[PDB]
């Protein structure tokens, strides 16, 4: 299942309160909670590079599915874990104390990043 493309991003959930937890400056928080962006996935058989924007950042990371991979996090720090593929529509990783699932359904990509009892889930579509 092809991954690629660029998805405007509709709606989220708990950017503030997940932002909060992993220690984003307040000043960058308040900047970016209504920064509704484009963000890309461009997938090459298992290799993955995605391009997000999320608040007022743009962060850059890839990624080959099974093999381990570094991936820089939302407040700069680098973590090592690898990505799975859990079927033929869901990219899941772990990190931080985060666990996160990238799911496509056709045209949306929904995205669940779950830290405590913080559900961090933003909702995209193919543009």
Same mark, same amino acid.
């Given at each position: #299942?092809?991954?690629? @493309? &660029?998805?405007? +991003?509709?709606?989220?959930?708990?950017?503030?309160?997940? #932002?909060?937890? *992993?220690?984003?400056?307040?000043?960058?928080?308040? &900047? !970016? %909670?209504?920064?509704?962006?484009?963000?890309?996935?461009?997938?090459?058989? &298992?290799?993955?590079?995605?391009?997000?924007?999320? !608040?007022? %950042?743009?962060?850059?990371?890839?990624?080959?599915? @099974?093999?381990?991979?570094?991936?820089?996090? #939302?407040?700069?720090?680098?973590?090592?874990?690898?990505?799975?593929?859990? !079927?033929?529509?869901?990219?899941?990783?772990?990190?931080? $104390?985060?666990?996160?699932?990238?799911? +496509?359904?056709?045209?949306?990509?929904? $995205?669940? #990043?779950?830290? !405590?009892?913080?559900?961090? &889930?933003? *909702?995209?579509?193919?543009?």
């Amino acid at each position: #299942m092809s991954f690629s @493309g &660029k998805y405007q +991003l509709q709606s989220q959930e708990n950017f503030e309160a997940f #932002m909060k937890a *992993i220690g984003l400056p307040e000043e960058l928080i308040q &900047k !970016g %909670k209504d920064i509704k962006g484009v963000s890309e996935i461009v997938q090459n058989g &298992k290799h993955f590079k995605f391009t997000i924007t999320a !608040g007022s %950042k743009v962060i850059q990371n890839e990624f080959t599915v @099974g093999e381990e991979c570094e991936l820089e996090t #939302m407040t700069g720090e680098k973590v090592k874990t690898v990505v799975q593929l859990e !079927g033929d529509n869901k990219l899941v990783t772990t990190f931080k $104390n985060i666990k996160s699932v990238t799911e +496509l359904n056709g045209d949306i990509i929904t $995205n669940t #990043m779950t830290l !405590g009892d913080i559900v961090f &889930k933003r *909702i995209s579509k193919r543009i």
